[PDB]
């Protein structure tokens, strides 16, 4: 192939399969919801504190993403494991992204 | 007008705004997610225990709507304040409802 | 036999054994009512407070046999363990279903 392959299905079915004039952004890094636990231990009494516990903390992955498309790339893969939430955003987005990939191939794809 | 006048504006504006032949559900009880906090109290630890725990509280009152809609009515309308996420619930549904309404005309209209 | 055939008694006596022109709905996830120890632990005063609890949890489980349902289907075959409560729901519903099958026939019945 007069180009790079890189070996790894896309992460979600509602992404695009096929670009035209494509802008990679090879993000190497976490790209999933936090686990908040490590950060805090915390107790719950009402349904009203969940809502914007999850809400904030799901757009809180929405950011790393929002701040990565800040520079405007049709595709985004990196070398570690994608939250599945964070793949219906960028499924609605319209981006093509890919799970963990060998380090081995990002640079030769760099 | 030759037949009953509510005089109470509609609860969502997705909602059907004019239903031919309908078939109209007077629902007189509570329609709003259920405070949670006077039947327990608890703690919290991880975001993995908050979704699981407001999307099942959102599905408890989907639940009351589907009770309903079991009849299948056109249009819903109660004397109590209905859930602004059971509004979007309704509105995705194609219902008309309508929030509080004196108990005064739901007979008239019985 | 022209056309799949599965090994597996029907769950509840009280259904159809023999339907026309049925409309398959291959559900494969978990059926049953929610054990709700995980979730919680808890105390318990008056009865009262008992039938609300037991009410709303097997209202549950309707819930996502209606939202199944949701798509009209004559029968609903699973491979999992089928709560019997939900099964008297799927016995007055009019449905016919099947217990635990085995994936294996559930992608050849696909």
Redesign the interface.
């Known amino acids: 192939v007069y180009g790079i392959v890189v070996d790894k299905e896309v992460v979600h079915p509602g992404m695009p399969k096929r670009l035209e004039n494509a802008k990679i952004a090879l993000i190497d890094a976490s790209l999933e919801?936090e686990?908040?636990?490590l950060d805090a231990?915390?107790?719950?009494?009402?349904?009203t504190?969940?809502?914007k516990?999850?809400d904030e903390?799901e757009n809180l992955i929405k950011e790393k993403v929002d701040k990565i498309l800040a520079t405007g790339a049709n595709v985004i893969i990196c070398q570690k494991g994608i939250d599945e939430v964070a793949q219906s955003y960028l499924a609605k987005k319209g981006v093509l992204a890919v799970r963990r990939a060998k380090k081995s191939d990002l640079e030769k794809l760099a």
Chains 1, 2, 3 share one sequence.
């Open positions: 919801v686990k908040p636990e231990e915390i107790r719950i009494n009402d349904p504190q969940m809502q516990f999850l903390e």
